[PDB]
Design an enzyme around this catalytic site. Structure first.
Site, short mmCIF file in Angstrom:
data_model
loop_
_atom_site.label_atom_id
_atom_site.label_comp_id
_atom_site.label_asym_id
_atom_site.label_seq_id
_atom_site.Cartn_x
_atom_site.Cartn_y
_atom_site.Cartn_z
CG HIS A 95 -9.48 1.24 -0.61
ND1 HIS A 95 -9.61 2.59 -0.42
CD2 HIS A 95 -8.37 0.88 0.07
CE1 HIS A 95 -8.64 3.03 0.36
NE2 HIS A 95 -7.87 1.99 0.67
CG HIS A 107 -5.11 -5.68 2.03
ND1 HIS A 107 -4.91 -5.85 0.69
CD2 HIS A 107 -5.06 -4.36 2.27
CE1 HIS A 107 -4.72 -4.66 0.13
NE2 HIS A 107 -4.83 -3.73 1.08
CG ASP A 155 -2.55 -1.16 2.40
OD1 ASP A 155 -3.10 -1.33 1.28
OD2 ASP A 155 -3.14 -0.82 3.43
#
Ligand SMILES: O=C1CCN(c2cccc(F)n2)CC1
Ligand SMILES: [Mg+2]
Ligand SMILES: [Zn+2]
Length: 313
Positions: free
Chosen positions: A68, A106, A217
């Site tokens: 991430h 995001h 994603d």
């Protein structure tokens, strides 16, 4: 105004393909993003000085976590770029502006832990945001950066257009909460099949943009197998750390996060492709036919995981 970004020939050509990998040269990623904004939106959409300052502040607020991270942010933006470029006429000027920025932002300030772990830890963010905990945080961080002096890339928008783009970005980022994907896709499946899907209906557009966000994603599963396989290591490096931290709270983690159960990963990936990825790209392909390459690449990777189980690799 007359200053284009130009990529080397191989990147200029492959960046248009859904399965493009942005490569290991971190210093080229800002330029890759600006290139995509320019072709996707226009050389006029953003003041270059403000955009560049926004990009570098967003980069600084991604952490050094295995998955991430800043590379994920740019990877997700590129998938959105590929969707938007293959669906030229279906999206408004505001939407193209909002969605690349939404994808870049995001996972802002991700710590490498799930909403579940924050809740079981009793993290302050879990008190501030009872659902979509990290996603509300990511939207909060996006707003904070937009409000830094010289960072407001939306300044040339009118007041109503500004409110609309921040609303597009907020919904887009919330939609990346995978807990919300299941019901969103179910509703989209119902609407496509009963023929009630209406892209002039704002609530319907919201749902479709949500599914695009899930598709972007998860786009690690739509790359060529060696990229998908190597990316899986990074995703499991985070899950295994979370599993370690679950054990420290005296909670046995789900097998997916338990590094003692690495053997179960291949079967866990099949479940994921069958329960999440394939249905996602299938519904997306039904609504947006030119995104079929994502579904085809995902199916190819499902077949590669089936071969891992059968001991063929
Ligand atoms: O069940 C799961 C399997 C691993 N997961 C993901 C998510 C995106 C991509 C990818 F390869 N895997 C999330 C949870
Ligand atoms: Mg996220
Ligand atoms: Zn993400």
């Amino acid at each position: 105004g007359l200053m284009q970004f130009t990529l080397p020939v191989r990147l200029c050509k492959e960046i248009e393909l859904f399965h493009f990998d942005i490569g290991p040269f971190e210093n080229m990623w800002p330029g890759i993003f600006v290139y995509m904004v320019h072709r996707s939106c226009g050389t006029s959409c953003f003041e270059l000085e403000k955009l560049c300052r926004f990009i570098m502040s967003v980069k600084k607020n991604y952490r050094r976590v295995p998955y991430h991270n800043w590379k994920h942010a740019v990877t997700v933006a590129h998938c959105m770029y590929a969707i938007l470029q293959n669906n030229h006429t279906l999206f408004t000027d505001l939407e193209r502006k909002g969605l690349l920025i939404a994808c870049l932002c995001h996972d802002l300030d991700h710590r490498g832990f799930s909403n579940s772990y924050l809740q079981k830890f009793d993290h302050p963010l879990a008190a501030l945001y009872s659902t979509s905990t990290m996603e509300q945080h990511h939207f909060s961080q996006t707003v904070s950066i937009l409000q830094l002096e010289g960072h407001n890339i939306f300044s040339t928008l009118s007041s109503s257009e500004y409110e609309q783009v921040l609303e597009i970005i907020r919904k887009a980022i919330i939609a990346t909460d995978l807990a919300l994907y299941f019901g969103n896709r179910k509703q989209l499946e119902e609407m496509y099949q009963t023929g009630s899907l209406n892209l002039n209906n704002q609530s319907h557009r919201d749902r479709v943009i949500g599914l695009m966000m899930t598709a972007c994603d998860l786009c690690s599963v739509t790359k060529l197998w060696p990229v998908t396989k190597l990316t899986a290591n990074d995703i499991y490096a985070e899950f295994w750390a979370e599993g370690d931290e679950m054990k420290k709270l005296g909670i046995q983690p789900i097998p997916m996060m338990d590094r003692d159960k690495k053997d179960e990963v291949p079967q866990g990936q099949l479940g994921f492709y069958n329960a999440v990825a394939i249905p996602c790209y299938t519904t997306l392909t039904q609504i947006l036919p030119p995104t079929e390459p994502l579904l085809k690449a995902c199916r190819d990777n499902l077949s590669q995981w089936e071969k891992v189980i059968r001991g063929e690799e």
